[PDB]
């Protein structure tokens, strides 16, 4: 009751089970997944989507049941000399499967290359940083998101 | 495959298609443009830069482009005289159109 009655959370929309009927259920297990995403591409968290982050670092199955909750937390992350805390990898690799959680940070690129360093022309370093230093950006503010399940 | 596997190509960059899948999806008609340029001046041949060749000579568009190839050819272009037969445009008065 309190979570849906809470207006401090910017976004609370989910399906599989209607929120009003959640007060009468006794499901087996509850998963609490939390991470940080930019204010943009938040809708990509929903399953059956396609995008830079959705298909690559957190994919949800089409048989998913549970809810997604996101709220703004730009009061303690930005307005300083940079943030540089929350990394990510770019459009690379060979796509994702729902619920892997794979971390194999390594240097690779097409073009018949060896593995020695960065070497901008042939290879790249996959991961880089977010930037929320500007106060600008409705979809650039450092939002925080959690995803429950059933 | 004969051109892809050859090691004589210093640079082989493909746009919109990964090089080893072109034998699958077949396109209706292709093109083969050709010319001679410097070594450090190769990089102007790309979708939307600005230099001496991307504005006043053969210029790529912002649309789809295929695979651009280059290699070193100092073997048969040499000697004291210098191949002065080569020439380029350096006094154009306005920008160009894709494939002018």
């Amino acid at each position: 009751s309190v979570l849906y009655n809470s207006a401090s959370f910017s976004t609370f929309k989910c399906y599989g089970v209607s929120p009003t009927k959640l007060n009468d259920l006794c499901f087996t297990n509850v998963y609490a997944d939390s991470f940080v995403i930019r204010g943009d591409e938040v809708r990509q968290i929903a399953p059956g989507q396609t995008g830079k982050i959705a298909d690559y670092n957190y994919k949800l199955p089409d048989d998913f049941t549970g809810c997604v909750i996101a709220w703004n937390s730009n009061n303690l992350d930005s307005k300083v000399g940079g943030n540089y805390n929350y990394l990510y990898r770019l459009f690379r690799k060979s796509n994702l499967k729902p619920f892997e959680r794979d971390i194999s940070t390594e240097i690779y690129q097409a073009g018949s290359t060896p593995c020695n360093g960065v070497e901008g022309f042939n290879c790249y370093f996959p991961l880089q940083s977010y930037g929320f230093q500007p106060t600008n950006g409705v979809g650039y503010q450092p939002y925080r998101v959690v995803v429950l399940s059933f | 495959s004969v051109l892809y596997n050859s090691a004589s190509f210093s640079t082989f960059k493909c746009y919109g298609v990964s090089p080893t899948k072109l034998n699958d999806l077949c396109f209706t008609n292709v093109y083969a443009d050709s010319f001679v340029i410097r070594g450090d001046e190769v990089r102007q041949i790309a979708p939307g830069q600005t230099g001496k060749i991307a504005d006043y000579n053969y210029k790529l568009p912002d649309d789809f482009t295929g695979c651009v190839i280059a290699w070193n050819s100092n073997n048969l272009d040499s000697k004291v005289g210098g191949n002065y037969n080569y020439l380029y445009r350096l006094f154009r008065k306005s920008n160009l159109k894709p494939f002018e």
Partner: antibody, heavy 120, light 113 residues
């Protein structure tokens, strides 16, 4: 080798046209873009714009309403004209040789520098 | 516009040991080519700026081979293997991906004695 050099007035009245000239010596006509750049006192550097040999040019959007630039092949000189200036434009002006033409921006050579002051 | 940032703003370094200056960007710097465009200038007191690094990995003519850079995307780093008496000045980093091209605040290197 190329040795750039500026010349012009030092004091200008407010809301008056500003004229300078960066003469180029040594390396003559060629396929090289030329630019201009300035520096507020005790601050960072500010690039203005670049001009080609033929005359085609692109401008900084902030200063695209009251600034002009040309070229003259015979005298190996190019000039910068800035009109309706304010006191905020008092700075030192450098003329470059490479040009930051959104491609590589190799600033291969820089000038000595000229200081201009805006006052009545 | 895109704004450059550096860290720190002042740096005291004793001769002999390597140093490092970082310049972080606000937008991805990687054109349609495999190249990433960047520059690093050096302004000694009382003189005009000079070029040290362009394309972030190729030196300029006549520059001593002690300076180098690396990184791609939005992170780059310049290092000086051995500082000397003439390395007193203010360093800048330029982006040149698209118009306009603006510099940074300018790191001040200090030499100790």
């Amino acid at each position: 080798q190329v040795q750039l050099q500026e010349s012009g007035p030092g004091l200008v009245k407010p809301s008056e046209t500003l004229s300078l000239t960066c003469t180029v010596s040594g390396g003559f006509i060629g396929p090289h873009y030329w630019s201009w750049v300035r520096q507020p006192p005790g601050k960072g550097l500010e690039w203005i714009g670049y001009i080609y040999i033929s005359g085609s040019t692109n401008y900084n959007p902030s200063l695209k309403s009251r600034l002009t630039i040309s070229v003259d092949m015979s005298k190996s000189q190019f000039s910068l004209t800035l009109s309706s200036a304010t006191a905020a434009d008092t700075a030192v002006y450098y003329c470059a040789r490479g040009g930051g033409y959104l491609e590589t921006g190799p600033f291969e050579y820089w000038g000595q520098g000229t200081l201009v002051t805006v006052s009545s | 516009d895109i704004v450059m940032t550096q860290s720190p703003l002042s740096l005291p370094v004793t001769p002999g040991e390597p140093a490092s200056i970082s310049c972080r960007s606000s937008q991805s710097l990687l054109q349609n080519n495999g190249y990433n465009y960047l520059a690093w200038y050096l302004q000694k007191p009382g003189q005009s700026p000079q070029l040290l690094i362009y394309l972030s990995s190729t030196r300029a003519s006549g520059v001593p081979d002690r300076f180098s850079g690396s990184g791609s995307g939005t992170d780059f780093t310049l290092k000086i293997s051995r500082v000397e008496a003439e390395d007193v000045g203010v360093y800048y980093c330029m982006q040149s991906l698209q118009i306009p091209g603006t510099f940074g605040q300018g790191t001040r290197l200090e030499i100790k004695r």
